Ligand SMILES: OC[C@H]1O[C@H](O[C@H]2[C@H](O)[C@@H](O)[C@@H](O[C@H]3[C@H](O)[C@@H](O)[C@@H](O)O[C@@H]3CO)O[C@@H]2CO)[C@H](O)[C@@H](O)[C@@H]1O
Ligand SMILES: OC[C@H]1O[C@H](O[C@H]2[C@H](O)[C@@H](O)[C@@H](O[C@H]3[C@H](O)[C@@H](O)[C@@H](O)O[C@@H]3CO)O[C@@H]2CO)[C@H](O)[C@@H](O)[C@@H]1O
Ligand SMILES: [Mg+2]
Ligand SMILES: [Mg+2]
Ligand SMILES: [Mg+2]
């Protein structure tokens with residue numbers, strides 16, 4: 001056959017380098033199929049390979065490395081189904097005798113040439129597809145990690161391209177005590193090593209010898225176990241652990257039960273979530289013991305303000321705590337001597353942070369002040385023209401203990417910095433002690449926020465690249481042309497469409513479910529996962545805990561060209577929940593990406609769109625009433641098929657109500673919809689109201705706007721979700737994206753002195769464009785103090801208590817919602833901002849689900865006027881006893897129910913009314929025919 005042929009010492013030589021290997025747009029997708037544009041209509045197409053070096057031209061423009069001949073072919077059905085985004089690529093066939101194993105041990109390069117054997121293009125090869133086709137089924141059948149057995153221990157790691165893998169065993173002091181070559185299984189490409197039970201507690205890493213296509217070199221490095229279940233401090237070494245060991249469990253752990261049922265849809269619909277962060281809970285609470293502040297174990301401090309506050313929220317109807325990342329994140333240093341927090345001396349900050357020591361704040365190094373004391377004194381002269389609080393805090397953020405933690409280092413070990421001792425197994429028992437305290441002592445279920453859509457890093461060099469060091473280019477999603485790891489998620493996008501990463505996800509969830517007794521999972525950026533993968537994971541976890549609940553962010557991920565995505569639209573009818581942005585934006589106003597004056601112009605139902613305009617808005621009545629349509633639809637569970645009367649009087653199904661061009665209603669059951677008006681992401685509800693409220697809306701009115709906004713969630717049929725501290729009017733001083741804004745901007749004050757509003761301009765890098773609008777709105781009214789915080793907590797607990805009190809609020813099943821739930825004050829003659837929902841328990845609905853009532857009315861008067869309703873004239877309607885008992889502290893203070901059944905609501909009020917049930921089920925509130 002032909003010889004494919006082509007600072008330098010000749011032009012001739014530099015000229016040859018220009019025709020070399022470029023990009024990575026060839027895809028080896030199965031054993032015998034290669035997809036590559038560069039080979040179309042070319043008489044010579046070959047896959048060259050080199051075990052130990054780069055496929056390169058020799059001295060006189062010759063490609064001498066071993067090659068395999070490729071013949072043109074057409075894509076198979078199987079290939080097009082697996083990789084639809086590649087189905088248009090020119091296909092090429094490999095001989096069916098090719099030793100795939102041999103080629104995958106090193107570099108492979110696709111090379112094309114003309115009839116005379118002259119080179120046109122040469123590119124690197126993406127091999128994830130052939131890896132799955134060759135090894136995945138065999139590898140899926142095995143179990144991974146350091147697995148203690150009755151016989152001893154079996155280590156296993158999947159590394160189908162590695163040339164060598166050794167198991168390195170370390171002493172407690174991190175000295176090498178053994179290095180064992182592992183045994184490669186040819187069918188699966190897994191490597192294993194079996195030893196005795198004496199390895200319990202040992203530290204270990206895998207020493208890899210593996211080609212990495214990013215560097216094009218056979219790399220040698222030690223990597224922690226992607227299936228690690230225990231770690232040394234800062235995740236440097238994995239550790240052999242038996243999670244079933246009683247020494248790693250609090251007393252009574254094996255009998256720990258879920259306090260709230262999750263079996264039926266009606267059970268699930270009661271879910272009322274408090275989204276919390278380990279430091280946000282306790283970092284500021286002086287009544288938590290100092291050594292437990294910012295720790296899992298703070299939840300055991302029963303006498304603390306924070307724990308007593310959570311206990312009261314639970315008693316009032318908050319049912320679930322959702323924890324921001326408590327798997328092992330990368331972005332906090334777990335070595336305490338490398339960290340400085342704001343409660344500590346400025347001198348400590350300077351010793352750990354060279355950016356501070358070289359900054360304008362260096363003069364504070366030998367002061368006697370703490371960092372917090374310095375930040376406090378910086379407040380008085382802080383402004384848009386001198387944003388000095390955030391200037392210092394941005395430096396503090398580099399070396400503090402604070403991060404949301406959407407930065408996965410190891411998926412199946414607890415985070416170490418939240419433990420009192422991050423070295424070894426201690427964090428496991430502390431984490432479980434926290435879970436037990438939440439369930440047993442606080443009476444709430446636990447949801448974990450999980451982040452399988454990306455890794456913290458990829459490539460052969462980064463400290464936190466684990467998966468992409470062990471099986472390069474497999475676990476990350478790559479650009480089809482360049483082979484670069486995509487970053488659409490924020491970071492290093494993962495590839496849950498690949499079989500062994502799907503397996504890693506499911507195996508990880510199994511540990512959190514069985515070993516840590518987690519009750520549900522919130523999937524970060526779930527739209528980057530295939531629908532089929534999320535559903536497969538759910539099927540596997542339901543075998544372990546039949547009542548587990550999955551939900552996540554089902555936003556469009558722009559991955560639909562590669563697979564059917566796990567989105568709001570596509571998950572309809574599956575029982576997987578998604579956050580709904582429909583009611584969220586209708587009630588808050590605007591959207592997450594608004595900036596500048598739009599933050600004020602875009603009022604929501606909760607901040608007086610239409611009815612109480614500010615000086616900048618141009619919102620029309622029609623627009624306001626459209627937001628109310630989205631809000632009503634969301635209060636009915638955001639169902640695709642729910643029938644309502646829209647702002648123009650037209651009969652519309654939920655899918656026909658527009659949300660920014662998309663069908664508004666998307667769900668089959670309300671348990672597929674998670675409603676919210678505040679979350680860790682974007683501005684807090686209070687900060688949104690502060691951006692949007694008319695100047696004449698006083699402080700007490702703004703507190704009621706907060707409660708009215710939350711009422712649309714708490715009294716709706718969707719699952720209810722809220723940010724920790726909404727009940728305390730929580731502010732982040734206008735910070736939109738506070739993931740690294742530290743204790744200062746994320747403070748929640750459980751001593752009830754203030755809501756953390758007006759503590760300095762937020763981070764300039766992301767909110768600087770908002771400084772002008774912030775300065776204009778910030779000082780309109782006073783900052784909330786103890787009086788307003790206590791009043792808001794009472795409003796909040798009134799709402800959750802109402803939701804908890806009757807199964808009519810939480811019907812669960814979509815057909816049941818359609819049979820029972822209706823709205824009044826609809827159409828072109830509605831009173832703007834008055835939301836009136838009815839829930840039938842009468843004879844036409846079916847059985848009485850609530851023996852105390854024949855029906856419920858929810859009236860939310862999001863308006864500065866009193867409103868009168870005649871819709872229930874002649875009925876026996878009564879204001880709920882829960883609200884009557886709150887007197888002038890109720891959201892229903894001043895509501896009048898006249899003798900004739902007419903109801904008058906004051907401005908910015910919420911009333912829950914009921915038809916008392918007598919001897920037999922009554923007529924109720926039948927849904928109107930449409
Ligand atoms: O340096 C890593 C990464 O840091 C920053 O990204 C962070 C986002 O700013 C932060 O909001 C958070 O984003 C997650 C959302 O909170 C979560 O609810 C969901 O939507 O997923 C988001 C991604 O996980 O965390 C990310 C990562 O820490 C920064 O913006 C990036 O540019 C930077 O690369
Ligand atoms: O991923 C990095 C990104 O994280 C955070 O952005 C998140 C938004 O905060 C969050 O609201 C969500 O945005 C979605 C909208 O809510 C939804 O209505 C629709 O428009 O889709 C959006 C996603 O395309 O998710 C994003 C992405 O995580 C963080 O705030 C950003 O600063 C950061 O860059
Ligand atoms: Mg960590
Ligand atoms: Mg930080
Ligand atoms: Mg793409």
Ligand SMILES: [Mg+2]
Pocket residue numbers: 841848849850851852853854855917921
């Ligand atoms: Mg009844």
